[PDB]
Assembly symmetry: D2
Homo-oligomer: 392 residues x 4
C-alpha cells in the first residue's frame, strides 16, 4: 500500500507545479516553490525529482540569482534524501524556439539550442543525474514544404553527437533519452513514435549512449498499444527512462494520472515492467510521472493527484502479481501456448535444407486441422480482467 525508495517513483517539478494555464484559459493555481515541492514529494513517497532548466531557474536569471536557487534546491534534496535521476532542457517555450531548437531553419537558433543544453548538462552532472531527456517538442512543422526532413535529421544528429562527445570527454557518464511525440505543439513532430525514435538513435555516432523515454499518452495520441511498444523498446534494450500518465486516445495531450486513461493497457504495462524474466522487473529505471493535476483542482487536488499516481501503480502491480501466480491463469497460458512462442521455430542446427526436406512442415501438413483448434485467448483475457477487478 505504501511506496518505498525501492519503487523509484519520480515526478517532474513541472508536473505538481503546473499552474493550469491551458490553451483556452488563465492559470487557476499559484506558482509552487521548488523547495516546497521537494518536501511534499519526499513526503508522499517519491524517491526523486526531475526538472527543466527553466522550471528551477527562471529563464534569464543572472548567475547570482541562478546560483542562489541551485544552493537552496541542493539543501532541500539534502534534508529530504531525494535524488535527481534525470534533468531536461526547455527547448520549446521561448519564442526563439518557434520552429524548433536543434532543427530550427535558422542557424543561429540551432547554435543557441546546443549551448542551452550543454549548460543544463553541467547542472545535471553536478546534481548526480544519470539521464538527460530530450523532448524535441518544436522540431517539426505545420506545412510539408516548410521543413526538409532529411536536413532536419542531419541537424538533429549533428547536435546529439556533440552532446555525447562532451559528456564523454567531461566524464559525466550520462545516458541520452529521446522522447517521441506525434504532435502538439507542432502539427507533426519529427520522430513521432517510439519506433521512429529507436530507428534514429541507431544512426548516431555512439548509439550505445542513446535510448528513448516513451510516454504513455504520446503513443496513445496515435492510438498505438503502449505496452506493445515498450515491449519492442525492451527487446532493443533502448528503454532508458519512461514517462507514465493517462490519455483517452487521439485528442490533445491530457496528461492524466497514470491509469486514469486506458486502464487495461495500464495493467498490461505494470505486468510487463514488473513480472520480468525470473521474478525480477524487466525494467530498472525510474517510474516517472509526467502528468498534470487537472485545471479544476487546487493544491489539495494537486497532492491528491500526486499520490493517486503512486496508488494506481501499486494497486496494478499487486494484481499483476496475483494474475501470474494464479494456477488457473497458469493453465490458461499453457492452453493458449503463450510460452511456446519462446521455442525456436527451427530445431538445433536446422537450416533451410533440413527444413525443405521436412515433409511435416509442408507436404504432409494438415493446415485445415490445425486451423480449427481455438487458442483460448478470450478466456485468458477474462481471467486477467477479473484479477484486475479484484474478483479472483
Amino acid at each position: 500500500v505504501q511506496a518505498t525508495r525501492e519503487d523509484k517513483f519520480s515526478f517532474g517539478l513541472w508536473t505538481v507545479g503546473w499552474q493550469a494555464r491551458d490553451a483556452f484559459g488563465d492559470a487557476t493555481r499559484t506558482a509552487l516553490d521548488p523547495v516546497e515541492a521537494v518536501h511534499k514529494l519526499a513526503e508522499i513517497g517519491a524517491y526523486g525529482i526531475t526538472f527543466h532548466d527553466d522550471d528551477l531557474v527562471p529563464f534569464g536569471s543572472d548567475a547570482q540569482t541562478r546560483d542562489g536557487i541551485i544552493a537552496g534546491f541542493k539543501k532541500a534534496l539534502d534534508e529530504t534524501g531525494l535524488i535527481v535521476p534525470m534533468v531536461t532542457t526547455n527547448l520549446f517555450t521561448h519564442p526563439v524556439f518557434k520552429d524548433g531548437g536543434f532543427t530550427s531553419n535558422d542557424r543561429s537558433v540551432r547554435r543557441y539550442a546546443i549551448r542551452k543544453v550543454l549548460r543544463q548538462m553541467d547542472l545535471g552532472a553536478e546534481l548526480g543525474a544519470k539521464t538527460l531527456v530530450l523532448w524535441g517538442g518544436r522540431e517539426g512543422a505545420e506545412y510539408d514544404s516548410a521543413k526538409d526532413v532529411s536536413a532536419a535529421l542531419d541537424r538533429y544528429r549533428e547536435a546529439l553527437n556533440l552532446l555525447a562527445q562532451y559528456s564523454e570527454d567531461r566524464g559525466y557518464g550520462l545516458r541520452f533519452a529521446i522522447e517521441p511525440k506525434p504532435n502538439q505543439p507542432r502539427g507533426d513532430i519529427l520522430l513521432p513514435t517510439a519506433g521512429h525514435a529507436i530507428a534514429f538513435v541507431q544512426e548516431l555516432e555512439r548509439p550505445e549512449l542513446f535510448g528513448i523515454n516513451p510516454e504513455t499518452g504520446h503513443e496513445q495520441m496515435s492510438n498505438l498499444n503502449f505496452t506493445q511498444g515498450i515491449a519492442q523498446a525492451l527487446w532493443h534494450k533502448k528503454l532508458f527512462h519512461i514517462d507514465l500518465n493517462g490519455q483517452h486516445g487521439p485528442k490533445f495531450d491530457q496528461d492524466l494520472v497514470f491509469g486514469h486513461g486506458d486502464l487495461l493497457n495500464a495493467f498490461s504495462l505494470v505486468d510487463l515492467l514488473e513480472n520480468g524474466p525470473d521474478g525480477a522487473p524487466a525494467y530498472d529505471g525510474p517510474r516517472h510521472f509526467d502528468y498534470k493535476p487537472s485545471r479544476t483542482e487546487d493544491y489539495d487536488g494537486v497532492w491528491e493527484s500526486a499520490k493517486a499516481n503512486i496508488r494506481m501503480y501499486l494497486l496494478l502491480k499487486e494484481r499483476a502479481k496475483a494474475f501470474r501466480a494464479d494456477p488457473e491463469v497458469q493453465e490458461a497460458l499453457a492452453a493458449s501456448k503463450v510460452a511456446e512462442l519462446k521455442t525456436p521455430t527451427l530445431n538445433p542446427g536446422e537450416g533451410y535444407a533440413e527444413l525443405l526436406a521436412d515433409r511435416s512442415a509442408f507436404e504432409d501438413y494438415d493446415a485445415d486441422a490445425v486451423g480449427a483448434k481455438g487458442f483460448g485467448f478470450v478466456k485468458l483475457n477474462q481471467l486477467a480482467i477479473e484479477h484486475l477487478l479484484g474478483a479472483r
Copy 2:
C-alpha cells in the same frame, strides 16, 4: 500518358478484388490473371505483382500449378510486363489466424517459412527483385496472449533464414517489411514505418532489408505519410512503396492514390520526384495497393486503375511547376528552408569552440530572433495554388 520509365505497377489482387467485404458478398466475378496482364499492359503499367495464392489457388496440385505459371509467363512475354515484386499470403487461411512467423503454434511457424521459400523460388524464376512481407496476422487482440519479445525473436529467426537461402542460391532479392498498425488483428507487430526500420536494423544481414510503407497504413494512425517516407529515405530503407488513399483513422479504405489526403499526396510526389540532383529521390516501382470500390463493375475497375496513374502524373506536373516558380524560390528563401542544410557548426568546430562563442549564448538576443516570422503560411498558400492549377 504513362511510360515504362514511370514504373507504375499494380498487384493482381487490386484490380482482381471481388469486393467481398466484412459485411457483404462479392459484387464482382473473378478476374483472370492473363486478362489482368493484358488490361494492365494496356493502361500503361510496366509491372504486375501477386501473392502466391492470387495466381495459384491454395492447394493446387503441381500439374495445375505448373499450367498456370506457364500461361502467366506467356502473358508477361507478349505484353512486355515484368514482375518487380512478389509476396506470400500468410493471412487468409485459418491456420494463420494467430500469425505465420509469430503464431503461438510452432508447427504453423514452420509451415509459414516453407510457404515463403516456395514463393521465393517462383519470384526468382520470374525475375522479381523484391520480396514484400506483410505480417497482417502477427499481433493480438489481448495483451496477455502474445509475448512481444519472443514474437520479435521468432520474426527475426525466420527472416535471417530467408536471407541465408536467397544469398546461398544467388537470388539477389531485397526484403521489404510492410508495417500496418491494425486490421485484421487489434494491434499488429511493427505498427509504423519507424517500428519496422528499427526492427530491420537488428537482423543478421540488415543491408538486405528495408520497408514497404503504405500511404493508408500510416494515415490509419493519423501520421504524416510524406514525413515518414522522408525519414525512410534518410535511413536509405525505402525498398518499395504501396500508394493508395485513406481518410484518417478508420478501417483500411485502399482508395485510389490521392483520393484521401490530397495535400499529403502532393507533398509525397514532390519528395519522390524533386530529388537531390534534379533527379528522383526514389528509383523503385510506384506500386498501387488499392481496391476498386464495391459499388463498381469491371468498367469501374479499369477506370479506377487509370485514375491511380492519372493522379500521380497530375501531381508530378504541379510539383515540378511549384519548384520552378520564382515566387516559390523567393518564399523558400524567406522561410530559410535551405539554411537547414548548412551544418550548425563551422568546419572543425567542436564543443570547445562552441562554448567559446559568446554570440551563441551569452550575447545572443533570443528576444529579437524570436520576433521574426518564418513566412510558412505564405509558402504553403503558393503550394496549394500550384496544386489547384491557380498558377
Copy 3:
C-alpha cells in the same frame, strides 16, 4: 454472481454464430444451428435472442423452407422459455444493397428494401418482438459527389413513415430504433453518431414511435464518450434499446466482449443504467450484446466469450453499487458539488428582471475568489477506480 431473467441479457444469433470470415480471411468456425444457439444461450442465462431475417432463414429460401425453419425456431423458444425482444433486417449483405437499402441512388432497390423490412416486421410481430432495430450500414458514400444527403434523408424519412403507418394499422405496437455508426462498411455512413440519429428521428411523422439503438464501439470509433452520449439519449427519452460491446478507439469495428475495450467507460455506463433516479435503473430494455467471438477461438471460446459478457456486466454492476453506498464517495460527491447541478440556476419565480437586479450575480460577484476553489474531481475519480479495482 449469476444472471437472472430479470437482468434481461440478450444476444443476436449473428454474435455467437459469427463464423469469423473477416476482411482478410476465411471462416475459422462452422455454422451454428439456430436451435442449438437457443439452447446454449438459455443455458448461460440469456433471457432473449434476436436476429436478422437472413440469419434465421437463408436469403431466398422458398416458403416451405422458411416456414419449416420458423416452426422449429418457435419450438426451441417454447421449450427453453427464451423470448425474442427485437428483430432486425439485413439490408447490407446482398450485392443489391451496395449503395444502401432505403437510400440507394437506384429507385427499385429502395422499393425492395421496404418490402424486405415489411416482411420482417410481420415475423417480428408473430414472435412477439417489441422493437425493430434499423442499422443502415450501406446508407452513405465513399465520395461526396455520389450522394445527395438531403435527398437521402428525405428517402430515409419516406421509408420510416410508411413502416410506422403499417405497424400502427396492423396493431403490431412496435417501437423503431435507428442504430448510428460513423463508417464501415461505407467510407462515411448517414446518421453517424447517436446525436445525428436523435435529431433525425425528431423529424418523422410520428417521432414518438422512434428512438435509437446506440452501440458502445460505434461511438468509440469516433472517440466519443459513450456514457455521456447515452446520458443525452436518456435525457431525450430516446434510448429504445442498446448494443453493448468493446472497442479500442478509432479503428475498424472490433465488437469485443462488453468491458474488454474502454473498461473505465464500461464502468460509468453500468453506473448510469442501474443506479438511476429513485433507486431503480434509468433504463429498462434489454441489455443486448452485439459482439463477436474472436477469430482465434473455437466453439469452446465462443461460449466462454458469451458468458464473459454477462460476467463483465454483473461485476461492474456490483462495483457501481458499492461505489455509491460508500460514505466516503458520498462525501467526495458533496465536495465536488455534483448534486448542486440539479438545483435550478434561477430561484423559483425569478426571471431576467430579477436576475438583472441581483448585484451578487455580477456587480458584487467575486469571480477571483470562486475561481480559486478546487472541485476535488481527481480525488472523486480515484475513489471510483478504487471501487472498480476492488481495492475498497
Copy 4:
C-alpha cells in the same frame, strides 16, 4: 479573384489578433489594436467583424473605459463600412469558469455566466448583430462521475430559454447558434457534434430561435465528414452560422486557414453551400473564418493568412461551378443516378397496401441482376478532383 461584400467574408477579432501563446510556449506576437484590425480587415475584403466581449473590452474594465473602447470601435466600423454580424461571449478564460459557465457544478458561477451573456446581448443588439454564438468550451468533464449530464442539459436549457425570453421582450431579434466541439479544453465537451447540438436545440422552448454554428475542425477532430454534417444541418434548417478553418483529423484543434487541412472536403463543402437549388447558394449567412495564423509568423504572415482564407474559398468556388457545368460530369452524375434519389421511392398515392401488391418490388424482383450493375462513382470522383486540380 477578388472578394466583394456580397461574398460575406467575416473574421473574429481573436483570429488575426491571436498572439500565439499555445499550451507549450509564450506569445510570439504583440497585441492587435481593434481599430487597426477593423481597418486591416476592411482592406483585405471582409464585410464584417465579430468578437467575444473580452476581446474588445478587457475583463474587468470600468464603465468609462468600456464605453470609451466601444465608441472608438463604432467609429472604425463607421469609417470602414464593416458590420458586426455576430457577437459571442467568453465563458472559458477566467478561472471561475474552469468547470463551465452555464453548467458549472457551482450555482453561483451559473448565475454569473448568464449575467455576463445578457450584457453582451445588449452590446450586440446595439451594434446591429443578428446572431449570438454560444460555444460552451468549459461545459463537459475530465471524469465521468464528476458531471451529471442530464442535470447539465437541464441547466443548459434553463439558461438558453431565459436568453430567448429576454431578447424577444427587448425586441433584439437575435437568433442563437450553439457551437459543438468534441473536446479541448475539457476532456469531453457536452454537445460534441453538429448532431447532438441539433437534437438539443429541438428541446428548447422557442426552438425556432436556435440553430447551430458548426466549425470545420470540430467535426474533423472526431474524424467526421464535415460536408455531410452541414448537409444534415441544412436539411433540418439549423445552419444559422458557420466557422470555416482547416484541421488534420483527430488531434488538437489546429485552426488552420480554410482548405489547408482536408482539401477534398473543403471543395465539396463550397460546392454544397454555393451550388444550391435554383442555381443559388443553399446558405446565405456569413462565411466566417475562425482560424489562427501559425505561431511561426509575424504580422505580415498574419495578413497573408487572412487573405489566404478568402483566396481558398474563391478558388474552390470557381472550381465547384466549373465542375457542375461540365457536360462530362453531367454524364457521370446521370450514370451514377445521383438525381434519381430525388424522386420519391413511392408513386404518388401509393402506401404500404399498394407497395405490398407490387410483385415487382419483391416477389419478382431480380436482386442479382440489379446487384451486378456498377454506379460509376470512382469516375465521378476522378472528374471532381480533376476540376479541383484545374486539369480540366
